Ligand binder design. Structure first.
Ligand SMILES: *[C@@H]1O[C@H](CO)[C@@H](O)[C@H](O)[C@H]1NC(C)=O
Ligand SMILES: [Co+2]
Ligand SMILES: [Co+2]
Length: 434
């Protein structure tokens, strides 16, 4: 797809800290851009929509190639249309924003320049950030994660995509998402099937796969961290159900691991560590600091800071595993106790280390779940299981919670705020910001 300018594109600025082993940190200046799927897609020479509701223009988009040639992505009014704002080192995303039409959440990427994404090499380093999840009820997910996307959004590999990172193109993750309207410089109209429960989305014949590090997926009730390996480290297109993931019949028939080696303290037994109020170790009604360290062994460590008090990820005992470090033993013990073989089939942490050794793009989003109502994160899942089933209970939310239309109607003012991002060698982000 090309880019149109009927609406200007001004990326909200966002600063972050780059720290060094020497003990100092220096301020960096970037910005955020919203993913192409949230944008208006119209004819290059008119205001005629190429996509509207959840169906494509049969005339402008008779096939994927013709569609990309006739269509363009336009600019975004970040605050008024998408409820996205920034102030210094802070980023806020509102859940439902009402303008000429209704918008739900957003998916944003941190940029290095107005035309390129910022790439981070996680291995050997740590990522720290502050988050306020107090306004996120059951069914919502304020997420901060990394994916192995190209810095240019795919332009160099696919010339038919001239919009690029400036317009949020090139997304990919461990779900091999098929809901993307444009993949590899081509539209995804071929094989497109409108969503039965979402008037604005659908699933196409193509998907976009790549490694994914979910540093943070949470709301005021539950939180989870999870590395997701793929047999192909970087962005790669997939065909239909061969894609695997939540958008296909068989989520395990692809090149990526859709489940990941997830670590949810509540799911592991510590139901007093994270929640609203003083009865929990971490009070989710207040801002908290989350630090994630990627040691060269490939294992992942985590600690939190709130009100000046530091807490390592809580210890967990699963099978023969005991500790608080997310390593091979934990992931293997998890599949043995909770079930599944997706993470290990895709190479586990060894394969994932190939992703963190390379560059990954920072993603920050706010979303509700039209496929599973976010039950996998904050409730009992599958809903027919009980606490007698190992790992079934992940949070205290009702198995009836998270219906998109309901949470959108009841909690439109929900929001998430990410701030004070700091990146650098392990042991360096706690030092004074520059
Ligand atoms: C939960 O984790 C916190 C922090 O490590 C710890 O202080 C507390 O004793 C743990 N409680 C349970 C039930 O595991
Ligand atoms: Co194809
Ligand atoms: Co270690």
């Amino acid at each position: 797809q090309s880019a149109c300018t009927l609406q200007s594109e001004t990326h909200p600025p966002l600063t972050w800290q780059k720290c060094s082993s020497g003990g100092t940190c220096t301020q960096q200046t970037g910005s955020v851009v919203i993913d192409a799927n949230w944008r208006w897609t119209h004819a290059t020479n008119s205001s005629t929509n190429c996509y509207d509701g959840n169906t494509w223009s049969s005339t402008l988009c008779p096939d994927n190639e013709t569609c990309a040639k006739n269509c363009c992505l336009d600019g975004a009014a970040y605050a008024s249309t998408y409820g996205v704002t920034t102030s210094g080192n802070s980023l806020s995303i509102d859940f439902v924003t009402q303008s000429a039409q209704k918008n739900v959440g957003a998916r944003l990427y941190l940029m290095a320049s107005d035309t390129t994404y910022q790439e981070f090499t996680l291995l050997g380093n740590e990522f720290s950030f502050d988050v306020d999840v107090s306004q996120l009820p059951c069914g919502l997910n304020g997420a901060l994660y990394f994916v192995s996307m190209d810095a240019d959004g795919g332009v160099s590999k696919y010339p038919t995509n001239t919009a690029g990172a400036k317009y949020g193109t090139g997304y990919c993750d461990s779900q091999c998402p098929r809901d993307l309207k444009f993949i590899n410089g081509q539209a995804n109209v071929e094989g497109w099937e409108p969503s039965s429960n979402n008037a604005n989305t659908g699933i196409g014949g193509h998907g976009s796969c790549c490694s994914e590090m979910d540093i943070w997926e949470a709301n005021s009730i539950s939180s989870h961290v999870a590395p997701h390996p793929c047999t192909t480290v970087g962005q790669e297109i997939c065909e239909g159900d061969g894609c695997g993931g939540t958008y296909s019949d068989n989520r395990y028939g692809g090149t990526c691991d859709p489940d990941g080696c997830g670590w949810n303290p509540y799911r592991l037994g510590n139901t007093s560590f994270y929640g609203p109020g003083s009865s929990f170790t971490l009070d989710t009604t207040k801002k908290l600091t989350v630090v994630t360290q990627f040691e060269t062994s490939g294992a992942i460590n985590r600690y939190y800071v709130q009100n000046g008090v530091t807490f390592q990820q809580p210890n967990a005992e699963l099978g023969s595993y005991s500790g608080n470090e997310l390593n091979d033993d934990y992931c293997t013990a998890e599949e043995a106790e909770f079930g599944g073989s997706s993470f290990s089939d895709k190479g586990g942490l060894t394969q994932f280390k190939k992703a963190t050794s390379g560059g990954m793009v920072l993603v920050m989003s706010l979303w509700d779940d039209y496929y599973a109502n976010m039950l996998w994160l904050d409730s009992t899942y599958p809903t027919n299981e009980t606490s007698s089933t190992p790992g079934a209970v992940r949070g205290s939310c009702s198995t009836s919670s998270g219906v998109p239309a309901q949470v959108e109607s009841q909690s439109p003012n929900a929001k998430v705020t990410f701030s004070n991002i700091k990146f650098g060698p392990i042991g360096s982000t706690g030092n004074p910001s520059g």
